[PDB]
């Protein structure tokens, strides 16, 4: 693979010091791009996807418009439960999901065996390898997956939610079955993520979008352990492989209550939403870890000029060392490409400015 | 009105000390009762409601099954925007909402004038007066309303949501219009709540369910001020009236980031969800204020025995002084009446036990 010209992102990730603050956006490859829809629904929501070339192309598009400091592989969170044998549909033109969710401990039999999962998701590796290849070391490439708990919530609650129903209920109701499933999700995610790095992924992001549902206690009996094993095991397997381990990021939506432990689940990076205060976040986490976030995506609805100081304040709130700018959640589909770039420009503009 | 025999609830509210810990549940009058559906959809979702007798009866039902330490008036959050002139519908058998939400600054013209609102909501007062009358001083009666911001989000985003869209967008997009609307909601809520207390409401709860959407900054420019004015003005008007002011409770779902200020918006009580840790909550708030909550309603899916220690831990986590037990959110419609009572029994059981 070609050598990395710009690595501000990996260095900020690693805690190293940098000349400016690296920036990128979650779902930066998303429906907010006209070029994106021209490609996405120019086949299928879950079998392109299947074509590396198309996945590559989606992964590249935003980088064509904005000097983002990193790229993140395009794919869908559900590809794992899908690889595990769950069938997805394409219902009335908003989003994907499972018509036949797990509902009783019995249903777990329908799942494939964790190690087979890697071989099912080979198009993803290829799209990764491809994309590392075509970025040609422009900026780094981030692989990803959803975290065990989050995955469980999609698999159990059918898909698209609010603040919880059946999943949280299994936890109280049948936790033996919950233990089990969560292990299966974990045992699948380790080889998938090793996978992405072998295929040439230079950093990995774990998404725990449905942290917020859980209490602190629930979170520690049920999400935390597994967030921990995945990191532990992915690092182990990578040594075994003779590979350099890679920065790992854990992003927990509504995870204010869990920053303390998350700082010590052995991730180099902790991703935050806009609901946490940056100073109170840094307090909570210390100085070993680098923070990521956390601008409210809705702020991009303001003017170019309004954005400037929101970034400025954020940048001042977070302060130069150990930090990667980002939105506190992925982008929305109706957002103005201009303002996505305004955000980027202001990150770059005022960070180098912050450094007199 | 008859004299109050049991007032544990008002005393815990006031910071006074009590022999046991008072307990009650949000949406304790809800679809989780067979007696409830036998009455609710034995007319209309928004015009019974219109019949005090029926509202009384809904308010009384849970008190018939459980020795709750207080009662809360049955009504719907939307009655205010409705009184303000917004039209509600009755769509495919889950929940209420607005088919014609406000979408442009222009639409505000369609709203009634704040002071008229009180006269529109006279059935509510009557149902209150009635219910104070029939409880015959058994336990206190809580009136309620939704907070300005929350109300704005229903009025703007049509109704039932996830973690935000159009409302948060107005805030960035057209905040002058946001200022205005929020004032109108405030100017309506003050006479409505004075109203409930004149009608015989003994405590008032303000609901800010859609706090979580907002950043700390958004929350302080846009929800906090108004949560503050409502409390200020409701207390003022009640003096003017020659009435004893009454404990006020502010409940902010996902408001971890705002406990500090909420402790000083001049509410006697701060209601919390399960997502905040009780000890970290008490830290955050100090000793002037009484806390409320915060058991996860999904915990009621566990066994009678499991519940016992969850309560026990909660009770130990919160500790005897300045505290009202509650669920961190309202109940769900499929929950076992037995376990609602298990929760109550364990609160009463182990609080008096905690006090050797």
UniProtKB/Swiss-Prot annotation, chains A, B:
Changing residue 271 to E: In FPCT and HEP. Changing residue 183 to P: In FPCT; insoluble protein. This is Uroporphyrinogen decarboxylase. InterPro entries: UROD/MetE-like_sf, Uroporphyrinogen_deCO2ase_HemE, Uroporphyrinogen_deCOase. Coproporphyrinogen I binds at residues 27, 29, 31, 40, 76, 154, 209, 329. Homodimer. Belongs to the uroporphyrinogen decarboxylase family. GO terms for molecular function: uroporphyrinogen decarboxylase activity. Pfam families: URO-D. Its EC number is 4.1.1.37. The keyword Mitochondrion does not apply. GO terms for cellular component: cytosol; nucleoplasm. It is linked to Familial porphyria cutanea tarda: A form of porphyria. Porphyrias are inherited defects in the biosynthesis of heme, resulting in the accumulation and increased excretion of porphyrins or porphyrin precursors. They are classified as erythropoietic or hepatic, depending on whether the enzyme deficiency occurs in red blood cells or in the liver. Familial porphyria cutanea tarda is an autosomal dominant disorder characterized by light-sensitive dermatitis, with onset in later life. It is associated with the excretion of large amounts of uroporphyrin in the urine. The lineage of its organism: Eukaryota, Metazoa, Chordata, Craniata, Vertebrata. Changing residue 250 to T: In FPCT; decrease of activity. It is an enzyme of class 4 (lyase). It is found in: Cytoplasm, Cytosol. Changing residue 76 to N: No activity. Unable to bind substrate. It catalyses: uroporphyrinogen III + 4 H(+) = coproporphyrinogen III + 4 CO2; uroporphyrinogen I + 4 H(+) = coproporphyrinogen I + 4 CO2. PANTHER family: METHYLTETRAHYDROFOLATE:HOMOCYSTEINE METHYLTRANSFERASE RELATED, UROPORPHYRINOGEN DECARBOXYLASE. One of its GO terms (biological process) is heme A biosynthetic process. The keyword Lyase applies. Keywords: Acetylation, Cytoplasm, Decarboxylase, Disease variant, Heme biosynthesis, Lyase, Porphyrin biosynthesis. Catalyzes the sequential decarboxylation of the four acetate side chains of uroporphyrinogen to form coproporphyrinogen and participates in the fifth step in the heme biosynthetic pathway. Isomer I or isomer III of uroporphyrinogen may serve as substrate, but only coproporphyrinogen III can ultimately be converted to heme. In vitro also decarboxylates pentacarboxylate porphyrinogen I.
């Amino acid at each position: 693979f070609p050598e990395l010209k710009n690595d501000t992102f990996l260095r900020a990730a690693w805690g190293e010091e940098t000349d400016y603050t690296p920036v990128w956006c979650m779902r930066q490859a998303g429906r907010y791009l006209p070029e994106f829809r021209e490609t996405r629904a120019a086949q299928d929501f879950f079998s392109t996807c299947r074509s590396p070339e198309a996945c590559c192309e989606l992964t590249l598009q935003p980088l064509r418009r904005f000097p983002l400091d990193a790229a993140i592989i395009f794919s869908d969170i559900l590809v794992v439960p899908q690889a595990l044998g769950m069938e997805v549909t394409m219902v009335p033109g908003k989003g994907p999901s499972f018509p036949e969710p797990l509902r009783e401990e019995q249903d777990l039999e329908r799942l494939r065996d964790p190690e087979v999962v890697a071989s099912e998701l080979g198009y993803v590796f290829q799209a990764i390898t491809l994309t590392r290849q075509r970025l040609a070391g422009r900026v780094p490439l981030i692989g990803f997956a959803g975290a065990p708990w989050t995955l469980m919530t999609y698999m159990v609650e059918g898909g698209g939610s609010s603040t919880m129903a059946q999943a949280k209920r299994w936890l109280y109701q049948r936790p033996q079955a919950s233990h089990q499933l969560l292990r299966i999700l974990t045992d699948a995610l380790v080889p998938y993520l090793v996978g992405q790095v072998v295929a040439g992924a230079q950093a990995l992001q774990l998404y725990e979008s449905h942290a917020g549902h859980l209490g602190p206690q629930l979170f520690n009996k049920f999400a935390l352990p597994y967030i921990r094993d995945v990191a532990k095991q992915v690092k182990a397997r990578l040594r075994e492989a003779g590979l350099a381990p890679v920065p790992m990021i854990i992003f927990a939506k509504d995870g204010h209550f869990a920053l303390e432990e998350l700082a010590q689940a052995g991730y180099e990076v902790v991703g935050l939403d806009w609901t946490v205060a940056p100073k109170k976040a840094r307090e909570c986490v210390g100085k070993t870890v680098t923070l990521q976030g956390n601008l409210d995506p809705c702020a991009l609805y303001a003017s170019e000029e309004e954005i400037g100081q929101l970034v400025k304040q954020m940048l001042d709130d977070f302060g130069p060392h150990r930090y990667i700018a980002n939105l506190g959640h992925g982008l929305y589909p109706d957002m103005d490409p201009e303002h996505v770039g305004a955000f980027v420009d202001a990150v770059h503009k005022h960070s180098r400015l912050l450094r007199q």
